[PDB]
Amino acid sequence: GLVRLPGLIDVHVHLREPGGTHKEDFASGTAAALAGGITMVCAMPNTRPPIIDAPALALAQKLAEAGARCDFALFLGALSENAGTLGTVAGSAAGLKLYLNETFSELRLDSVVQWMEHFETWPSHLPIVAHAEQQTVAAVLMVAQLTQRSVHICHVARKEEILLIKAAKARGLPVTCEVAPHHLFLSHDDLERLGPGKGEVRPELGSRQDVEALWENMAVIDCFASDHAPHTLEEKCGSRPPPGFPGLETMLPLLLTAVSEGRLSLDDLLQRLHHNPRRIFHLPPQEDTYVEVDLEHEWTIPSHMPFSKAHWTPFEGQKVKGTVRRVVLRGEVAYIDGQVLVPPGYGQDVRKWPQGAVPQLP
Ligand SMILES: NC(=O)N[C@@H](CC(=O)O)C(=O)O
Ligand SMILES: [Zn+2]
Ligand SMILES: [Zn+2]
Ligand SMILES: [Zn+2]
Ligand SMILES: [Zn+2]
């Protein structure tokens, strides 16, 4: 007895093309998405070249249209000197990403004044998302208030962060957030097994109290998003390990296991992987699109999942209950039981669909 789910949406993935294609490309990363029950992804802009102007966006659009197997939208990235220059292309992007802390990015902003300049110049009806850890969450919320608009907080990982967001929502402030599976299912207790290279991620893995606080405050979490951040094992275990975990192929199995245990409901999962992504990012429906899952099948996560070029996973050894059996995307069988059945290039840029433009006042 399979359960039919709508097409799930991951609003935070790194597909590494252009410029990091040994780690992942559009074709391999979207294969990983489909195998994880994800039919639409929003790809981050910290590529090489980074997606920080109209020419880079045009390149990335063509690479994605040629390589993606599922549908997508592409983020633009903020830089210290590109505020006020993105207006002609802003509506074609998923949103604008701000990198406000140290991480795997060359995009960090130098001054809160540059955050203000972006919030003032980026069109007010279009999404802004931020990598903002600890007190940076409070700082970016202040900038959003000064400029009288909303903000979405990426990968919330700490008790401190979720309680600050909770307090802001209680005051009626327009803030949303997402949580990644590693911050729900891994902690400091896993660092001995992972070791110091594999364990590198931003935000870093939290304490048991951080993990417990995210679960206790599920009502505050608007979305789940993988922050799929593939790097090869050689890179993770070398002299200067980059932070990040692959996650597309493991996210839905981990969350289905939690549903089976009664830790959240099926509806709670679908709000966070379908309805709230749609409404926060103004992403369009996908016609004739659904995911069939088997909630009974028990399995153990192996040392690498089949599709991601990262070829490793921090969830190795965890026992899960739930698997993706079939995905149909826009009327075509896209995935069955380990086989991807749509070619590179089947996926489309949802921002080019009439229904994928963000409504605005004239
Ligand atoms: N989270 C990470 O540790 N790494 C991400 C970047 C990010 O989401 O900050 C990556 O692109 O590798
Ligand atoms: Zn980040
Ligand atoms: Zn994000
Ligand atoms: Zn990221
Ligand atoms: Zn529904």
UniProtKB/Swiss-Prot annotation:
What protein does this entry describe?
Multifunctional protein CAD
Q: What is the recorded phenotype of mutating residue 227 to N?
A: Abolishes dihydroorotase activity
What residues does Zn(2+) 3 bind to?
A: 97, 131, 155
What is this protein's function?
Multifunctional protein that encodes the first 3 enzymatic activities of the de novo pyrimidine pathway: carbamoylphosphate synthetase (CPSase; EC 6.3.5.5), aspartate transcarbamylase (ATCase; EC 2.1.3.2) and dihydroorotase (DHOase; EC 3.5.2.3). The CPSase-function is accomplished in 2 steps, by a glutamine-dependent amidotransferase activity (GATase) that binds and cleaves glutamine to produce ammonia, followed by an ammonium-dependent carbamoyl phosphate synthetase, which reacts with the ammonia, hydrogencarbonate and ATP to form carbamoyl phosphate.
Protein induction? Transcriptionally repressed following hypoxia by HIF1A.
Query: What outcome is documented for mutating residue 14 to A in this protein?
Result: No zinc-binding and no catalytic activity
Could you say which residues bind Zn(2+) 1 here? 12, 14, 97, 227
Q: Identify residues that carry N6-carboxylysine.
A: 97
Q: Which gene encodes it?
A: CAD
**Outcome (variant: residue 131 to N):** No catalytic activity
Please give the annotated consequence of changing residue 12 to N.
Abolishes dihydroorotase activity
Q: Which residues of the full protein are shown?
A: 1461 to 1821 of 2225
**What is the protein's quaternary organization?**
Homohexamer. Interacts with CIPC.
Classify the source by domain of life.
Answer: Eukaryota
User: What disease does the Swiss-Prot or TrEMBL record associate with this chain?
Assistant: Developmental and epileptic encephalopathy 50: A form of epileptic encephalopathy, a heterogeneous group of severe early-onset epilepsies characterized by refractory seizures, neurodevelopmental impairment, and poor prognosis. Development is normal prior to seizure onset, after which cognitive and motor delays become apparent. DEE50 is an autosomal recessive, progressive disease with onset in infancy and favorable response to treatment with oral uridine.
